[model samples]
Target: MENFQKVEKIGEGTYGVVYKARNKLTGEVVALKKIRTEGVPSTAIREISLLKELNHPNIVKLLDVIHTENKLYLVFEFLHQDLKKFMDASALTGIPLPLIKSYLFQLLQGLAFCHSHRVLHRDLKPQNLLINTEGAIKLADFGLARAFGVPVRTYTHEVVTLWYRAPEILLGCKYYSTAVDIWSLGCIFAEMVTRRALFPGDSEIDQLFRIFRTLGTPDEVVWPGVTSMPDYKPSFPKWARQDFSKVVPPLDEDGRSLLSQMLHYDPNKRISAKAALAHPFFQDVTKPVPHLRL
Candidate 1:
């Protein structure tokens, strides 16, 4: 703790309050996320273990974890804003297409790294994506994340932000996989271009309805066993046809093209992160690679 100086409160994280801090001697800026706790337990230890293993530019750097006064502290590289704040600011001034494409590339690349290592980012959304001063992206807040090799058995199915959640989760589908994360990436990808959410549902049923309204209602033939879930039920005059054009009336042709492949109803059919990097939208990225700047 003596090596750094806490400036002030930044925001409330999943576990505790975050702050902007700097190295006392080196003067290097960093973010301090103080975990509200007594003594650090296996969970904090687990987080530290995972953080130590996860090293990628698009992922936030975990500098140090301090134990003091019966509390745990997590230090990280300083970032200027999150994707949510970035979107809010950009919305007021109008976001650029190239910038959106750049961030999407960064986000997908970061996620691919995690999946490649068998790490599952259970929660992915604009707010959890951090933006550094150099306009680079980093995925943060891995409190709910875990490691999984594949989906052989039923999972808790209790993960992810509601708006970005996959249909499997909303319908209480037990057996899930990294494909859940893929579904979220699709939602985020569409949202980044549409300047709004694709599914802003209030409840589980509402969520499905919201998805149906835009992507068309998924039947047993289209989305196998969708109606067999424990929470599956009726809807208000279910419609089968969708006008994706009306879903995101403002998205350009390129944005629509990518979002289509991402939001595919079949998880197996959905584009992989690595494949997404090679998509036409990112072909000009020089070798079609996902580059993390900061």
Candidate 2:
């Protein structure tokens, strides 16, 4: 704490807070996060160990780590904003198509890399996606995200009501594979264009209804074993599926097709991160040039 000079607080959360900071001796600027814990945080240990093995241009680079007494500190490359703020900056106007493709592609590049290595970013939402002034997205906050060191971890009491959670998770799948992540990317892509939550569910139960209503209530024909899911109930309304062309008008044929596969109810049938990268929606998209504004 004494080694870095605090600039300004940039983010706040239920478990931690982030600050724009400068390394006083090294003259390097960094994003500093402090997680107050009862002891050395178990999550930080796992997050640090995993992030140490994952290095990619689209992943937020962890610069350093420090923990002592009751606090855990993480130093990362400075990023000015997260996707949540980027969307909020122009919520009413909506994002540009080319820019949306670029962001979504870059995001997939990150996930493609993560899943190829057998990691799952279980926690996927706008807040976990970092951005900079030049218009680029970087995946961050592995505290809740999981890697191949997956099976043993258990859920905590911390509450994060999620609109982007996969249907399998919403219903009661205790273990996960890559499909869960792709579902969130679909939710994100839709919000990027619609400029609001695609589901906007206020509670876990409400979330299922939102998804069911839009995609049509899943049946054994589409999602085998769905009815047996621990949280699934026959009481759910058998809503009819809505057309993506009408649901997200900004998307052309390519965008809707790509998003549809990403959101497929059957995790086994869901589109993968690598396959998503090759989708026609991103065919004409170029990588983000950090020096230019989107």
Candidate 3:
């Protein structure tokens, strides 16, 4: 901790507080996340271990870890701001189409790398996505992420944030996979174009209703075994699927096609990150140019 000087407090989350700091020797700016040494928070453990294995241009880099008497500090490459902040700043007019495509492409590329390594980023949202002045998008915050390799294992249903959560998780599906992350990406994809959250629900019940109303209520034909879930409701009102193009006019045909597959009610049918990366919607996106750092 003595190696750096704190510039200012950036934000705080479940794990700890984050600060914008500068290294004493190199004078390099960095993000310092201070984790309280209270029995080693689960978020800290998962973040440290998983981040150590993940090395990609679109993912946040964990530079080093510093352990002191009662606190542990994680050093990360500093980003200018997060996606949420950017969206709020440009609330008057939605993100430009080309920029949105670029951001979404980068997001999928990063997720593809994680999924290929058998990891699932259970928590993905605008707030967790960081961006820089060079128009680079990096997936950040892996506190709720977990690497899955077992063929059959149970996982907690209470994972992703409400609006970004997949239908399977919301319906109490104990066994989920990378499909969960894709669902979150779908929500983010829509948000980037619309400049507003797709399904902003007040509560769990309202969340389900909002999704069902948007995508139509799922049944055995649409999502096999959906009725067998622990939280499945039998008497829910049925609604027809809304045209996503109408919801997000900026999205092209290919973009809407990919988004539909990503947000499928059946986890089994959700698009994988690898396949999403190959979708025609991103075909026009030129290969990521050398990162332009300001």
Candidate 4:
């Protein structure tokens, strides 16, 4: 731990505090996440395990882990800003469309890599997405992520941020898949398009209804076995399907099509990150610039 010098506090939440640090030997900038060892939560364990195996340009790299008598420190490459703050800073002019497309494509590419490795990023929102000045977006903060594979696991429905949560999870489905992350990416996609949150609900019920109001209520035909979920409700007022053209007026037809599929009410029917990468929405994007500095 003496090899690194802490510069300042970067962030904090349920896990622990994140600090900006400098490598004394190499002068490299890094983010040091300090976790106290009081029954260290499983989220930290999961993040360590998954980040060790998953490596990609769009995914934040876990460079090293330093363990002391009572603390575990995770070292990550430094990034300029999270997507939320980046967008907030650019609020004066709004994010350019081409840049939005580029960011969305990079987001899906990172997600596809995670899914291919059987990892589910249970929590994905602008705040969890880190972006550098050259426009490279890397998925970060995997405290809520979990590795899922054969012997299909059951996860707590309590994961994910409210506004970006999937309908199935919000409806109390304990068992889900990569579709949950896809829904979050979709919410992010919409936000990038409009420069605001798509579904900012107040509570769980409010979140579910807000989604329904936007995508229309899902029926058994469209979403098989939706009614069998633990918290399925039949009395919720039905909402008509909203027009994507009007909702995301700036997005082209292909972009709208991709967004619609990603936001599908049925988990099984939602677009996969792999398939989303091949969509025409990103065909024109040039290679991303190297994000070596802020």
Candidate 5:
């Protein structure tokens, strides 16, 4: 513990407290996440193991692990802030279109890497995305709470925000897959346009309504088996889906075009991360995508 000195508390993470810490002799600053386990935390170990295998520019790195009982301390490269703070910092005036394009590209690229390795990040929100001073974004807290982890947070549906949650998961789909993550990417994609949550639902059902009203109510016609979903309801009000450009007039045709493919009601029909990289909106963007510099 003496090897490093704790700085200010950064924030509380899912497993433990996170901080801005410095190496005593080296003076290197790092983000330290300390997790307290019930006993032999298999999930923590599993997550750490998964974290070690993932190495991508858009994904944060797990530098070191201290496994002793008193300390399940994990160290990661320090980042300036999360996507939530980055967007919230400028809440007004909104982010520049070029910059939004850059971050979205980086976000999707990183997610594509995860998908290539056959992993699913069911829980994706602004807080789970890290942004550094370099204008870099990294996907964090992924490869956990799945066919993986002891998953203490699985019961934390309330603790976790559902704004970015996919419609299928909101309706309690018995068998969800990669499309679950695809749904979130679309929500994040749309959020980039307005700098605010596209579907900010109060509860599961309420969230469905928010999505339903905006995207037009989904049924057997649009979604093959949407009626079979446990949460499906015929009593819900019917509403037509609105045009992307009309709702967010700032978005261009290509921007709205790519966004349309992402937010599709059918998970299978939704664009893949790799495929989205080739979308027209990304045909030309500022290279070396820098941080939002908020």
Candidate 6:
């Protein structure tokens, strides 16, 4: 409490409130996350431990960790805005396409680093992509992120923001992979172009249907285990051929092509973040200049 000054409430997160704050001594802007818990679980421990070690330009910088009385607080370099806010402001304030691509590339750079270290940002969405004063993007909100892999495991199925959730997760597929994040990347890609959420499904079944309607329902040939999960059931609208034109009508050929690749139905077949960086959609990407100084 003596080390920092609380500025104002920023947003409500899963288990706490995020506040914009500044260090009393350094005068640096930092986000203060306060989580009230009688006991910290492995998830909390993992989050703290990982966030501390995950130091990269694209990743949000963890400024400090504080234990005051009975609560836990994490200090992060204060990012001025989130992708969702950017979208809203862009829709309302008119942000350019190049600026949007800049943010998206920053996000990929961060995710590529995280995935390389075997970290899965299980929860990735516009809100978790933060922007600083310099317009650099950083991945935040690893509260739900976990170190995961194949070989079959059971997950809480509580990960991923609804719109960004992968198809398998929606079908109650317990075991998932880094592709989940890729799916989110695709959704975010659409958001950047459309300035609107990609998928807004009401229920899990409805979620699958929404995906099916636009991308066509997954079959054994396209997405294995198409209808075998515990929660799996028949969909209302029969599957039909995908109509990319209707799905992302405004995007150009390059953008739509990348979108389809990232949003591939088969998680195992989905493109890697590192590879996605090389996609033609970003042919104009210069090596990201480091944003650490500013």
- Compare the candidates by lDDT and give the number of the best one: 2
For model 2, residues 162-223, the per-residue Cα lDDT tens digits are 78889999898877788998999899999999887898897888998999999999999999
Compose the digit string of candidate 6's lDDT tens values, residues 77-192.
77777777767767754456676667667778888898888878776878778876666788886644342222122222323247778988777778768888999888988877
Root-mean-square deviation (CA) per prediction:
5.7, 3.6, 5.1, 4.7, 3.0, 5.0
Candidate 4, pairs of clashing residues: none
TM-score of decoy 2: 0.88
Q: What is the Cα-based lDDT of residue 149 in candidate 1?
A: 22
**Candidate 3 lDDT score at position 112:** 92
Task: State the TM-score for model 6.
Answer: 0.85
Off by over 4 Å in 3: 1-3, 41-47, 66-72, 143-161, 287-294
Worst 10 contiguous positions by lDDT, candidate 4: 148-157
Candidate achieving the largest TM-score? 2
**C-alpha-based local distance difference test score of model 1:** 0.71
Compared with the true structure, model 4 gives a TM-score of 0.86
**lDDT against true structure, model 5:** 0.77
Can you give the lDDT of residue 244 in candidate 1?
Answer: 67
Q: Residue 254 error for model 5, in Å?
A: 0.8
Which of the two, 2 or 4, has more lDDT? 2
Between 2 and 5, whose TM-score is larger? 2
Higher-scoring candidate on TM-score, 2 or 3:
2
Ranking by TM-score: 2, 5, 4, 6, 3, 1
Give candidate 5 regions above 4 Å deviation. Answer: 1-3, 14-16, 40-44, 65-72, 147-159, 288-294
Query: Per-residue CA lDDT of candidate 3, range 102-210, in tens?
Result: 8989999999988888767776878778988777899875633343221111222223247887888778888778898899999988988888899998777898999
The clash numbers for all candidates, in the given order, read: 0, 0, 0, 0, 2, 0
Error of 2 at 140 (Å): 1.1
TM-score of each candidate? 0.80, 0.88, 0.84, 0.86, 0.87, 0.85
Model 4 regions more than 4 Å off: 1-4, 41-47, 67-70, 143-160, 287-294
Candidate 2 runs further than 4 Å off: 41-47, 133-135, 143-161, 288-294
